Write a protein that holds these residues in place. Structure first.
Motif, short mmCIF file in Angstrom:
data_model
loop_
_atom_site.label_atom_id
_atom_site.label_comp_id
_atom_site.label_asym_id
_atom_site.label_seq_id
_atom_site.Cartn_x
_atom_site.Cartn_y
_atom_site.Cartn_z
N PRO A 1 47.07 4.88 68.55
CA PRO A 1 48.27 4.12 69.04
C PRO A 1 48.42 3.93 70.50
O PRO A 1 48.31 4.82 71.33
CB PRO A 1 49.43 5.15 68.33
N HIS A 2 48.66 2.68 70.86
CA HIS A 2 48.74 2.33 72.08
C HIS A 2 49.96 3.03 72.87
O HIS A 2 50.95 3.41 71.98
CB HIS A 2 48.90 0.83 72.33
N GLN A 3 49.99 2.89 74.05
CA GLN A 3 51.28 3.36 74.73
C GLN A 3 52.39 2.91 74.48
O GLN A 3 52.39 1.49 73.92
CB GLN A 3 51.10 3.26 76.29
N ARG B 1 55.40 1.71 76.07
CA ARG B 1 55.59 0.38 76.74
C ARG B 1 54.31 -0.30 77.31
O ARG B 1 53.99 -0.43 78.41
CB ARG B 1 56.51 0.69 77.91
N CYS B 2 53.60 -0.88 76.17
CA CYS B 2 52.45 -1.35 76.43
C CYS B 2 52.56 -2.90 76.43
O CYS B 2 53.05 -3.40 75.26
CB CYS B 2 51.27 -1.06 75.38
N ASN B 3 52.16 -3.70 77.40
CA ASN B 3 52.33 -5.15 77.37
C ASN B 3 50.93 -5.97 77.23
O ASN B 3 50.74 -7.02 77.52
CB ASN B 3 52.92 -5.41 78.48
N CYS B 4 49.84 -5.15 76.60
CA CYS B 4 48.58 -5.70 76.43
C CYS B 4 48.87 -6.93 75.57
O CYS B 4 49.68 -7.10 74.91
CB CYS B 4 47.65 -4.65 76.05
N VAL B 5 47.67 -7.71 75.53
CA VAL B 5 47.54 -8.83 74.55
C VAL B 5 47.61 -8.52 73.06
O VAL B 5 48.42 -9.18 72.32
CB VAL B 5 46.45 -9.67 74.91
N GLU B 6 46.96 -7.58 72.57
CA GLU B 6 47.00 -7.21 71.26
C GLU B 6 48.30 -6.58 70.71
O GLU B 6 48.71 -7.16 69.73
CB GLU B 6 45.72 -6.14 71.00
N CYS B 7 48.98 -5.91 71.55
CA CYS B 7 50.24 -5.34 71.10
C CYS B 7 51.37 -6.64 70.84
O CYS B 7 51.93 -6.84 69.83
CB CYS B 7 50.98 -4.43 72.16
N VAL B 8 51.47 -7.37 71.90
CA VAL B 8 52.49 -8.61 71.82
C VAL B 8 52.15 -9.61 70.84
O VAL B 8 52.69 -10.09 69.94
CB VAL B 8 52.57 -9.15 73.24
ZN LIG Z 1 48.26 -2.16 73.78
#
Ligand SMILES: [Zn+2]
Ligand SMILES: CCCCCCCC/C=C\CCCCCCCC(=O)O[C@@H](COC(=O)CCCCCCCCCCCCCCC)COP(=O)([O-])OCC[N+](C)(C)C
Ligand SMILES: CCCCCCCC/C=C\CCCCCCCC(=O)O[C@@H](COC(=O)CCCCCCCCCCCCCCC)COP(=O)([O-])OCC[N+](C)(C)C
Ligand SMILES: CCCCCCCCCCCCCCCCCCCC(=O)O[C@H](COC(=O)CCCCCCCCCCCCCC)COP(=O)(O)OCCN
Ligand SMILES: CCCCCCCCCCCCCCCCCCCC(=O)O[C@H](COC(=O)CCCCCCCCCCCCCC)COP(=O)(O)OCCN
Ligand SMILES: CCCCCCCC/C=C/CCCCCCCC(=O)OC[C@H](CO)OC(=O)CCCCCCC/C=C/CCCCCCCC
Ligand SMILES: CCCCCCCC/C=C/CCCCCCCC(=O)OC[C@H](CO)OC(=O)CCCCCCC/C=C/CCCCCCCC
Ligand SMILES: CC(C)CCC[C@@H](C)[C@H]1CC[C@H]2[C@@H]3CC=C4C[C@@H](OC(=O)CCC(=O)O)CC[C@]4(C)[C@H]3CC[C@]12C
Ligand SMILES: CC(C)CCC[C@@H](C)[C@H]1CC[C@H]2[C@@H]3CC=C4C[C@@H](OC(=O)CCC(=O)O)CC[C@]4(C)[C@H]3CC[C@]12C
Ligand SMILES: [Zn+2]
Lengths: 649, 649
Positions: free
Chosen positions: B140-142, B144-151
């Protein structure tokens, strides 16, 4: 000694009848076979014989899940009345199927039908079996129905009528009987829960049963929503019309658990923070700075929306959170100017009767006009009953009425009075004085209106909703207190009205309990009520129980009345109020989160619509959808049935 | 009548398909054998047929734990999709092994993987089986992760994204999946619980699930610590670095149950009472006498440590309890001298503006310097965020700032003023007056700092921690009260500001509510706020609602505003506050012991370090360890697994 004997003796069976019943109970197929085969030739055995407990051979076989013996008995033409009900309640699919394929004591009331009892048991398999073969449940008539049939059946047999109504509603409120046989399970659950709550209100007796059924319907709707596995399914559910039409219907029917469901709230939050993709993951100071910046730019955003709605700056205020921030900032500037109306910034001479408005009042005027126009728009669109269901809207109505009266009295005083007569000489009911008093009351109400904005906050919202829920029990206790207050006011005024003295005789020409030396505390009924109210807060001094003539018995009786009032209100009533508030607050804090989420959903939905985008003072300047919904509902019902089977085992 | 019919009908099976399904359900091996053998030749039977509930032959066999029928079906090439998930959820080791060796309706969301579901069930055997064959769980990503995949995944499908994240964290938070597959189970539990708590904060929806998972991780860590059987094992656990490094990490992650574990507390107590082997078994009077003797000798112990750290008298103060007693005694003498600063012992003439310090102030100066130096050392070593997490440290900062301002103002007044002008003629903002006011506020704060020492006590500690925990709800309620206060202050000031009178016209040249005859209670906004605040405590007299001109309507409206404020704040708000305090105190007293033990552990740890040994005013003058830890962890995991198997049965 106390003799003991069977007072209500029942006719016992023969030795052979008891042998037959013990044979069918035991499970010996051959014994029963021979027994009823022999019974066929003679009149020897009554196949429909009854045990003391009223259970015949067939009922005994059903109770033991003995399909072979049941089949044999049904083959040999046993009386079958009410056997299907016992089979259904036992919840044996095999027995129910066997009985479907084919006045004694009964454990079921005469109105119970097979489908009704199956719905009561909530057994999906048996309900499906009974529904596949066409069955019906009679429609319960409306709650306040004055037709001939309702009154006739109520007066002939009220107990049976109420029992039948409750059984029918238990059958309808079955989650299994709604998963099947209901075109829109969610809407059916909503309407059935609402109707059951209204029945609980009207049917004062059997209130708990109807409340339980309503809670059951609410839980079923929320679980069906729980079964959603993608945002597409959730959007199809929530946007279905028979946007967010399903959610609006849920709000209308007070389906708080359905609305406060986590995924529904997540979708609402994405709609609410439209302009901020990462508002959830921002820091507190970043949120505060963004809110301050949007609030300070509320005139700019409102004017941009007015001039050019279809532009990047114009449609920024259409976003629900931006719209909320702009409205809040406008109201905050209104309250700030209300504060300025009392500070001495270019203040008019206080000796001018009917003065023209100051610059502060001239700036307050557009805000007041905007508030009045917005409130009449809201009550025009929504209707009066929806408007009055909100206490905040009632306070808005009172506030705007007071503001309008202030404007009217200011105009009257302006056109009627021209001079600058000193303020000390003004009449008591001078229109300027009344206008100022009304304006101050309006200021109190306007500033108190800020409490409703706590609903938007995660920390203050639940607290504010809990206090609002406590207010009603507080009001009832205040009613009992007012009765006590009237009693003691009557007594004290009756005792003391003889010793009323004129204001001229008082030390400062001041008569009443608002002087430096309080006097005439109980001379008049109105003043007696004021005195007791202020003695609640300890602002009434004891020496007001004395009179000039020093009638010691009268003064002691008055002091004892005053002391009894103090014990009753401050030692008894106040602590009773504290205890009630504790109990009610525990009960409220049990559901505080759901209640607050429902209130915040209503607050958010009020900002989704295009109408009312501009805050004051700027506001005065099908078949395919049904197919998708049915597919999603089919999936939800399958998942819910599987989950309920999993939970039951 | 309400017609009942299957609204969403499903395609039913053939008679032979239902025969096949009833055969596999029944358990008749031969019947199913013949049925699918016949199906092989023709297209007659669909082996992958589905029951209404969506369960095929394989799922039915799994549900009945029928390994022979499962083996047969798998041999005859039955579609196997999702069967492993049902086997794992049923928690049958045999079925799971059989399936491992080899779009329909599904009861599991598409993201559920076999290892994920096994972790959800927390079954040690099945999880071990699935882990022995190499499996992975996506990171699981962090939060508060603003990377492309999460959004991208959130905007495409937010419900599925949140569901997948929660499922992954449920899988990771499994105690069995941490006993296996985690190098440091205790540290993994700590960090996972901390991350789950932070997720609960950020993910406002699904807060309860993440809180439950965090509590699960905390409980697993505490149970692993419970399995320790010797002090050597406990010391190896607590001293491991990847002294008391593991305990410090536990404190950092707020692992209160782990820290407040009885054996950990016993070890901490032995470390804390270093100089007293039998402090546990001493009498109360003996403890009191020893504490008094150590406290009175604090100058001697501090000076001995300064002069010769490596001596019998020198290193006595290095012991944590002795150090605590010496620091407490030093602070007590500081407070005693603060008391002396007001008593008239060699007191300066009060008419001297900018006087030199007295002997008492000269003795207070080293203590103030020591406090300032200690606080800057603490914030330098620990950082600002750790410093501000402690409210006591915030109060220390305020107190030292006030002391520094007092010193500065005293110096300014000394260098600026030379004469002995009478005190009655001093300006309102005379620097000596401001210095004295700041010094008195600092005295209040310094004496209130003593409350933090209650944590060291077994009787007052839990109580103090409980009150501290109640303070936040008290603060929220004070916020709502302040809104009400501002509302009524605005109204009353708006009503009464016309009748403001000068101080000259008042009886004693005194204007305000602090005179013998109160007046101008609502003339200004600031004074109105003061008046309402004091009316909360009943110190505002009723006659302040009168005006000179005796405008009866205005005075009655003001008295009614004042009375409504009194009812709202004293009858409604105060009792609501009482109810909230009762509820919150019950909830707090549930965990008071654990919370107090955590706080006292922090207090003890603050005295273990060599830095800061001297109290004011005297402070201004690897591989082998990892192998041992892994052995101990292996033993703990084995004991925990055995204990969990014992508890489950
Ligand atoms: Zn991410
Ligand atoms: C829907 C919401 C309800 C509340 C808002 C509705 C507006 C209500 C405002 C109504 C005031 C309208 C002006 C009336 C006075 C006009 C001049 C006059 O003749 O004075 C006469 C007396 O006048 C009074 O007694 C006025 C008393 C007003 C008290 C209003 C308190 C409202 C508090 C609400 C909390 C002189 O009498 P006379 O001839 O000397 O004998
Ligand atoms: C970080 C923690 C924050 C708290 C501690 C930080 C220290 C704060 C202390 C600050 C005081 C520093 C001296 C200021 C006065 C200097 C002389 C002077 O010009 O007087 C001027 C007025 O002066 C005032 O108004 C002083 C008011 C100080 C109130 C401080 C209360 C703190 C309570 C805390 C609880 C004269 O004005 P004029 O020219 O006549 O016009
Ligand atoms: C004769 C001289 C007069 C002198 C001046 C008198 C001054 C009066 C001052 C105002 C008195 C009423 C104060 C109400 C304050 C708001 C209540 C806050 C608490 C709260 O959550 O209540 C919500 C709304 O209540 C409400 O908004 C209640 C409003 C009731 C109508 C007010 C009419 C007055 C519930 O609201 P909800 O969540 O149930 O919806
Ligand atoms: C303008 C003229 C001014 C006139 C003079 C004003 C006098 C003010 C008097 C002091 C007001 C604050 C009183 C706080 C007393 C300490 C609270 C004891 C209860 C308690 O356990 O709170 C702990 C620490 O709180 C705290 O230590 C809170 C400190 C907050 C900063 C104080 C700044 C003032 C929680 O602490 P924890 O266990 O959560 O950590
Ligand atoms: C709804 C109504 C329910 C209320 C039922 C209770 C009624 C109690 C009436 C009880 C009301 C008692 C009123 C007594 C009183 O008015 O005192 C002053 C008078 C005039 O100066 O002279 C005395 O008479 C002198 C004896 C005082 C004896 C006091 C003993 C009564 C205890 C009161 C409780 C105080 C407790 C605080 C803790
Ligand atoms: C958050 C806000 C929630 C608050 C909602 C509740 C509002 C109630 C406002 C209720 C506020 C009532 C204020 C009445 C008042 O100010 O009295 C004195 C005034 C001026 O002299 O003259 C009168 O007017 C005389 C009648 C007195 C009638 C009192 C009956 C009201 C009962 C109050 C409770 C006392 C109970 C103690 C036990
Ligand atoms: C306490 C005294 C000094 C009176 C202060 C009056 C106002 C300045 C306060 C009282 C109530 C406050 C409001 C309470 C509720 C909110 C919700 C808050 O939003 C949130 O808490 C969560 C973020 C979101 O709204 O989505 C935005 C600020 C606001 C309008 C606050 C703005 C500042 C207000 C108006
Ligand atoms: C109540 C009035 C007279 C004010 C008194 C102020 C001080 C003289 C009191 C208030 C708080 C007390 C402290 C509260 C906490 C403790 C913990 C106490 O230790 C224990 O309770 C258990 C033994 C241990 O510390 O290991 C040592 C005394 C001390 C410092 C107390 C010393 C005396 C103090 C400073
Ligand atoms: Zn009818």
């Amino acid at each position: 000694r106390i003799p003991l004997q069977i007072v209500r003796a029942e006719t016992e069976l023969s030795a052979e009848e008891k042998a037959f019943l013990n044979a069918v109970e035991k499970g010996d197929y051959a014994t029963v076979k021979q027994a009823l085969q022999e019974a066929e030739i003679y009149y020897n055995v009554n196949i429909n014989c009854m045990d003391p407990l009223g259970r015949s051979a067939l009922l005994i076989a059903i109770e033991n899940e003995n399909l072979e013996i049941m089949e044999l008995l049904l083959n040999h033409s046993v009386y079958v009345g009410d056997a299907l009900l016992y089979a259904i309640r036992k919840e044996v699919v095999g027995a129910v199927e066997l009985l479907l394929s084919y006045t004694q004591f009964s454990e079921f009331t005469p109105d119970i039908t097979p489908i009704m009892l199956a719905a009561h048991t909530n057994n999906y398999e048996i309900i499906k079996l009974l529904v596949q073969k066409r069955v019906t449940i009679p429609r319960p008539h409306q709650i306040r129905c004055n037709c001939v049939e309702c009154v006739s059946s109520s007066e002939v047999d009220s107990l049976r009528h109420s029992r039948s109504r409750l059984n029918i509603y238990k059958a309808l409120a079955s989650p299994s009987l709604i998963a099947l046989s209901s075109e829109d399970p969610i809407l059916t659950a909503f309407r059935l829960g609402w109707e059951l709550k209204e029945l609980s209100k009207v049917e004062n007796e059997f209130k708990a049963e109807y409340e339980e059924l309503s809670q059951q319907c609410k839980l079923f709707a929320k679980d069906l929503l729980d079964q959603a596995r993608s945002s597409r399914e959730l959007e199809i559910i929530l946007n279905h019309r028979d946007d967010l039409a399903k959610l609006k219907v849920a709000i209308k029917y007070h389906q708080k658990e359905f609305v406060a469901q986590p995924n529904c709230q997540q979708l609402l939050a994405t709609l609410w923070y439209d302009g901020f993709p990462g508002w959830r993951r921002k820091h507190w100071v970043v949120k505060l700075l963004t809110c301050m910046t949007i609030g300070f730019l509320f005139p700019m955003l409102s004017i941009a929306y007015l001039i050019s709605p279809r532009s990047n700056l114009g449609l920024f205020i259409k976003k629900p959170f931006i719209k909320f921030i702009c409205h809040t900032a406008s109201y905050l500037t209104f309250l700030f100017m209300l504060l300025l109306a009392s500070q001495h910034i270019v203040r008019t001479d206080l000796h001018v009767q009917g003065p023209p408005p100051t610059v502060v009042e001239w700036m307050i005027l557009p805000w007041v006009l905007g508030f009045i126009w917005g409130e009449i728009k809201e009550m025009w669109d929504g209707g009066f009953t929806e408007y009055i269901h909100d206490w905040w809207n009632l306070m808005d109505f009172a506030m705007n009425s007071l503001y309008l009266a202030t404007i009217s009295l200011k105009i009257v005083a302006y056109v009627k009075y021209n001079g600058s007569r000193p303020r000390e000489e003004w009449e008591m009911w001078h229109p300027t004085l009344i206008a100022e008093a009304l304006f101050a009351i309006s200021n109190i109400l306007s500033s108190l209106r800020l409490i409703s904005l706590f609903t938007a906050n995660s920390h203050l919202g639940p607290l504010q909703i809990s206090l609002g829920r406590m207010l009603l029990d507080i009001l009832k206790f205040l009613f009992i207190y007012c009765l006590v207050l009237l009693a003691f006011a009557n007594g004290l005024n009756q005792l003391y009205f003889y010793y009323e003295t004129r204001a001229i005789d008082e030390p400062n020409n001041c008569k009443g309990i608002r002087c430096e030396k309080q006097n005439n505390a109980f001379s008049t009924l109105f003043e007696t009520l004021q005195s007791l109210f202020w003695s609640v807060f300890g602002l009434l001094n004891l020496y007001v129980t004395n009179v000039k003539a020093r009638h010691e018995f009268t003064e002691f009786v008055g002091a004892t009345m005053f002391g009894t009032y103090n014990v009753i209100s401050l030692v008894v009533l106040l602590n009773m109020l504290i205890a009630m508030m504790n109990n009610s607050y525990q009960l409220i804090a049990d559901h505080a989160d759901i209640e607050w989420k429902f209130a915040r959903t209503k607050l958010w939905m009020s900002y989704f619509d295009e109408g009312g985008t501009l805050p004051p003072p700027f506001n005065i300047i099908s078949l395919i959808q049904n197919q998708h919904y049915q597919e999603v509902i089919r999936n939800l019902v399958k998942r819910y049935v599987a989950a309920m089977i999993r939970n039951s085992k």
